[PDB]
Design a protein around this ligand. Sequence first.
Ligand SMILES: *[C@@H]1O[C@H](CO)[C@@H](O)[C@H](O)[C@H]1NC(C)=O
Ligand SMILES: *[C@@H]1O[C@H](CO)[C@@H](O)[C@H](O)[C@H]1NC(C)=O
Ligand SMILES: *[C@@H]1O[C@H](CO)[C@@H](O)[C@H](O)[C@H]1NC(C)=O
Lengths: 187, 83
Amino acid sequence: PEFWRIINGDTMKKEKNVTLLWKPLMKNDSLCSVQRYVINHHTSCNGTWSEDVGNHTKFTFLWTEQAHTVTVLAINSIGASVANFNLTFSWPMSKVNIVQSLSAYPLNSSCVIVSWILSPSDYKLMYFIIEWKNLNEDGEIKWLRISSSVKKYYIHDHFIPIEKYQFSLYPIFMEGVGKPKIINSFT
Amino acid sequence: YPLNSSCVIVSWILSPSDYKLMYFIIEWKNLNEDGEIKWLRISSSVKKYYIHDHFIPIEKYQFSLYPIFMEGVGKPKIINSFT
Ligand SMILES: *[C@@H]1O[C@H](CO)[C@@H](O)[C@H](O)[C@H]1NC(C)=O
Ligand SMILES: *[C@@H]1O[C@H](CO)[C@@H](O)[C@H](O)[C@H]1NC(C)=O
Ligand SMILES: *[C@@H]1O[C@H](CO)[C@@H](O)[C@H](O)[C@H]1NC(C)=O
């Protein structure tokens, strides 16, 4: 399952509390079932901590180290999931981003625009995650995987014309997550 | 100019011509999208006629209006993009 993280807490503390969320596997991806869910922790110190979430689809974690690696697996009666995604975050990396511009405009009641230009970087970048939230009401967190090859992408989802949704595009690093560019309303 | 999210007004100024003209022909295309050429027929009399379809304001578009005579075709009047 594609697992995504979110900050819910104060920033002054050296430690950080992180909440994970992932989409439960569907039938074809499950191969007739995916019953337990297992989380394996990892750090730059290489401290591995494996826990079994089970049917629950969210997990809360906290730690004081700058770097920590998460590799969420899935347990099946045949065995654990061989191939799973990854994400790593580092505080010095989290303070730098190379994205320059951001915009949003409803072309329809079911379509909105994302446009962005980026300053050149020095290391490699793999993908972007785009999450948007409504400013009038605090709705559920919604996002979807976006690759780095594409430069301009059509979001196609149901929308309320009177409601104005904030947008925040997050850059991703191999060992870090750069700080997002946050816009409160459509351009 | 884009009046709504899915339309652009087509306005122009027609220079006097010693030879007559019956109608015109409007084209619009995207340089970066490289989409297929679209065309609806426009008479020489109507000034503010326009066609509505789903566009993208950020993208770079290409409109061109040609004058058609009864004996020849005038050179294209090509605009870089909507202002
Ligand atoms: C994380 O998983 C992906 C795909 O399963 C793999 O390509 C990548 O090398 C892994 N990273 C680490 C640090 O294990
Ligand atoms: C809304 O407009 C967009 C413009 O491209 C189009 O792709 C989409 O199908 C339209 N949706 C409806 C429900 O008409
Ligand atoms: C937006 O386009 C025109 C403005 O030129 C307007 O008359 C029309 O009603 C609008 N379209 C929709 C689908 O509301």
